[PDB]
Amino acid sequence: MDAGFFRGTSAEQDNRFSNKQKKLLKQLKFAECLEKKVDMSKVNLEVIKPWITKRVTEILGFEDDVVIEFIFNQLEVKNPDSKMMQINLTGFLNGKNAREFMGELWPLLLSAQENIAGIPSAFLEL
Amino acid sequence: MNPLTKVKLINELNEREVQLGVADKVSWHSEYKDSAWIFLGGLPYELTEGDIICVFSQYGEIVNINLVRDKKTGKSKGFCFLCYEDQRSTILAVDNFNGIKIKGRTIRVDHVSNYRAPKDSEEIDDVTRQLQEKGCGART
Amino acid sequence: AEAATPYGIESFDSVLKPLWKGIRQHRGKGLAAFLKAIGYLIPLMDAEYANYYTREVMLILIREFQSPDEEMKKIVLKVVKQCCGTDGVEANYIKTEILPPFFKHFWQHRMALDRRNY
Amino acid sequence: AKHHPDLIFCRKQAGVAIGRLCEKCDGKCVICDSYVRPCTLVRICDECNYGSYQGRCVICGGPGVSDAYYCKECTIQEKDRDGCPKIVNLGSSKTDLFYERKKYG
Amino acid sequence: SLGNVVLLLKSLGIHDLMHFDFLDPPPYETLLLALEQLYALGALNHLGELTTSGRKMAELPVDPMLSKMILASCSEEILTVAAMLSDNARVNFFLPGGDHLVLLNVYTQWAECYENFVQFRSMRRARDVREQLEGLLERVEVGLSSCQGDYIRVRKAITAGYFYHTARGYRTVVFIHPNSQQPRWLLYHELVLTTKEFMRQVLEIESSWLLEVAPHYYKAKKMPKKIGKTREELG
Amino acid sequence: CRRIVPGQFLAVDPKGRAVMISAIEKQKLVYILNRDAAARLTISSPLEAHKANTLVYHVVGVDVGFENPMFACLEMDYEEADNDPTGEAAANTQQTLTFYELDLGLNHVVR
Numbered sequence A: 001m002d003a004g005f006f007r008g009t010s011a012e013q014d015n016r017f018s019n020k021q022k023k024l025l026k027q028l029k030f031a032e033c034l035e036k037k038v039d040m041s042k043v044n045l046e047v048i049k050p051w052i053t054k055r056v057t058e059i060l061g062f063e064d065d066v067v068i069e070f071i072f073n074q075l076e077v078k079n080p081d082s083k084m085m086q087i088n089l090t091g092f093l094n095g096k097n098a099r100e101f102m103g104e105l106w107p108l109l110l111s112a113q114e115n116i117a118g119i120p121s122a123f124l125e126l
Numbered sequence B: 001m002n003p004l005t006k007v008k009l010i011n012e013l014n015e016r017e018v019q020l021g022v023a024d025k026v027s028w029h030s031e032y033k034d035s036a037w038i039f040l041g042g043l044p045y046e047l048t049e050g051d052i053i054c055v056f057s058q059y060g061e062i063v064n065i066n067l068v069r070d071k072k073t074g075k076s077k078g079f080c081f082l083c084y085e086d087q088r089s090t091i092l093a094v095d096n097f098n099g100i101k102i103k104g105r106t107i108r109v110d111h112v113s114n115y116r117a118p119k120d121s122e123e124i125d126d127v128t129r130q131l132q133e134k135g136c137g138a139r140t
Numbered sequence C: 001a002e003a004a005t006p007y008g009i010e011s012f013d014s015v016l017k018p019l020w021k022g023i024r025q026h027r028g029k030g031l032a033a034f035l036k037a038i039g040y041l042i043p044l045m046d047a048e049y050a051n052y053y054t055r056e057v058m059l060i061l062i063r064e065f066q067s068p069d070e071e072m073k074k075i076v077l078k079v080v081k082q083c084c085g086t087d088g089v090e091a092n093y094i095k096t097e098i099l100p101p102f103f104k105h106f107w108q109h110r111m112a113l114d115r116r117n118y
Numbered sequence D: 001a002k003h004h005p006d007l008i009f010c011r012k013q014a015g016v017a018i019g020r021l022c023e024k025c026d027g028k029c030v031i032c033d034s035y036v037r038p039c040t041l042v043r044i045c046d047e048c049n050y051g052s053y054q055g056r057c058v059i060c061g062g063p064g065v066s067d068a069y070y071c072k073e074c075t076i077q078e079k080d081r082d083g084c085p086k087i088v089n090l091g092s093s094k095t096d097l098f099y100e101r102k103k104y105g
Numbered sequence E: 001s002l003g004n005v006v007l008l009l010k011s012l013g014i015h016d017l018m019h020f021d022f023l024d025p026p027p028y029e030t031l032l033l034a035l036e037q038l039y040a041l042g043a044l045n046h047l048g049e050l051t052t053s054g055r056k057m058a059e060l061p062v063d064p065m066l067s068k069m070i071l072a073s074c075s076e077e078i079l080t081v082a083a084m085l086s087d088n089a090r091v092n093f094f095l096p097g098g099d100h101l102v103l104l105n106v107y108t109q110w111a112e113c114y115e116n117f118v119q120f121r122s123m124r125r126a127r128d129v130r131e132q133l134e135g136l137l138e139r140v141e142v143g144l145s146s147c148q149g150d151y152i153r154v155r156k157a158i159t160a161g162y163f164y165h166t167a168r169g170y171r172t173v174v175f176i177h178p179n180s181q182q183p184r185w186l187l188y189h190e191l192v193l194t195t196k197e198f199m200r201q202v203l204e205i206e207s208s209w210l211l212e213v214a215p216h217y218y219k220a221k222k223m224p225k226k227i228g229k230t231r232e233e234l235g
Numbered sequence F: 001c002r003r004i005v006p007g008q009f010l011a012v013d014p015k016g017r018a019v020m021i022s023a024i025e026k027q028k029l030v031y032i033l034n035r036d037a038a039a040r041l042t043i044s045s046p047l048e049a050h051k052a053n054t055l056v057y058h059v060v061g062v063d064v065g066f067e068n069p070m071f072a073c074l075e076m077d078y079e080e081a082d083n084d085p086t087g088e089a090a091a092n093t094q095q096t097l098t099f100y101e102l103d104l105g106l107n108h109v110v111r
């Protein structure tokens, strides 16, 4: 047998543990606006990227390209799940920085999809 | 596949032989009985050929040495071929010297079959010509 | 490619070109890994392309039967089996050109001592 | 098994692979572990006969020597419909036995 | 080839090509093939009478299959490619898997040679070659038109005009020249030998597309890999 | 006649390469049908497409030529509606048409 057969149980098989993703979707306090749905085809991404890079870089106190690219990779799907993104960032950032971070990245993407150009308002200004 | 696993694979070849109780007439080394050439690999680059001969002489008398070197710079690639005067010294050296450490680096010593000598078409050096045609050896 | 047998040939179309280029180009320690990968990709692929790739990789394996390098021997036994499954090899070709160096270089006493090689 | 509470079944969607039983497990039911009255043939899910594992024992995992069945009582209760019945974890009992013999021997 | 020779003779009003007087009359089989080559380009009817298409091509000093393909097919860009049809720097204007496309950006950037590894002679003639073909199109009311996509526009022309040259190395319905994986069908300008069969200046083309254009001349499936189990094998 | 066990809706691929059986909600299964060399029908293991909290009104197989088999559906998601005490989310949730593609290369069904 090239590996062992036994590799541990998956979460669909094993009832001894509760679903930690659902449990965190209950008890973390999420930001006010994350329920609005986002379409990423209507959003221009590479203009969004330098702000994220800068935002994560100053929160972290250094630059972590794995956290950067992780955030970018989560935004590649058509409808990005915002609550899972705040959960998945809570480990790296404070969990208070993650809430603020989504609280500014998310209305920015909303402003971007309302535009025709793909560009949010504060970036059209400047 | 890392070189250290090659060093371990030759050693496990020997330990496995001991566990099974194989006789020396049918040992793995008996496939290389015809040749008296052994590959040494993983050497430190600081070692010169006097060092190699100085150490591998514990098991017999070295007839020829081929520490292969870079063509442009001349520095050592790290591997060389040694010919012993006795063929049985190859058995002794592959068993005893495989995986020892010299300057903090483990080396692998394995039997080499049908070793083919370098052609003297190049006139790059003279001492190499002397080594090829005549080679190191005691003179009466 | 081992895990996906026999599916995904269309997913692996993107890497067939650098893999091939490396097998023709590289010599040395890269060749063992690249040759392993191409040997697993051969059963995934359909008969027309399999008959192509098996012939040239058969020519590489004939050259590599000589090689006194342990990873190369572990690789080319497997790849011999994988190219022997396809129908693009001929029985005459195998017993004329694979078979004598195969039984001269692989049926040895040191091959029988390691369990994976055995 | 019914004797080990910490063992866990695969329960994925079973397929066309037939599950088999090693000499030790021959003649017993995969669910309730009985020796009598075999009613239906066991099917295992695709992942569980992947590769080298093709044809091993359903209940323990050893070389399989005959086909596995469900008994009549597990058929009537429709226990044969829950999924792949391959056991996916060794459990405490198997592991303890190994370390105990190895300590001694 | 006798193909264009026929379109020039049948223009002259010669109703018998068998007994016409030449000093050394050509093979009768080469005539029948040439007569058959103008057939499938729709330059003639079934009984050998000229069509509106065949009468038009004779105004072009071209091989009729090529001219026909261009006309049928991108008119400004066919005017570009067909004129041309009569490795580092190569890469920039050379799109992968095609030769007309490579030629396309060749001329297009010419009016936009030494440093690009191109010949000022070949292009200066092609500049005049394209010049004269335009005068011949306008004269007889061949419309000047452009399409949104050139690759789509040019691919169709090659399939039509040159259809007699298509390969499934490859097999004609031959090996590639040193000139240039999903694609299995090709269209090619010219054929040549040195030690082998060589295919020159080629363009990828689906088998299905060719059938739609030339049904008479030409007169992928997703299937599951694994065979499953029958009822007997299951228990 | 269970609520989640398939059997209610049944759709076949118009070329005849797959069949798809689904329950009223959250459970679908595709079977790949084939012919062996003795011209006998062979069946595969089921490929599953499951989507929780989701109602199916009808499922029909789409006539794509010899591409990967498609199946079309009249789905609806009741997940949001059971969490709105005001009852608005029941009112303005809407039915979707979703297309499932059976990727015969990768042996799996993708929504």
Ligand SMILES: [Zn+2]
Pocket: D021, D022, D023, D024, D025, D057, D058, D059, D060, D061, D062
């Ligand atoms: Zn068992």
Ligand SMILES: [Zn+2]
Pocket: D029, D030, D031, D032, D033, D034, D070, D071, D072, D073, D074
């Ligand atoms: Zn039972």
Ligand SMILES: [Zn+2]
Pocket: D010, D011, D012, D044, D045, D046, D047, D048, D084, D085, D086
């Ligand atoms: Zn299973």
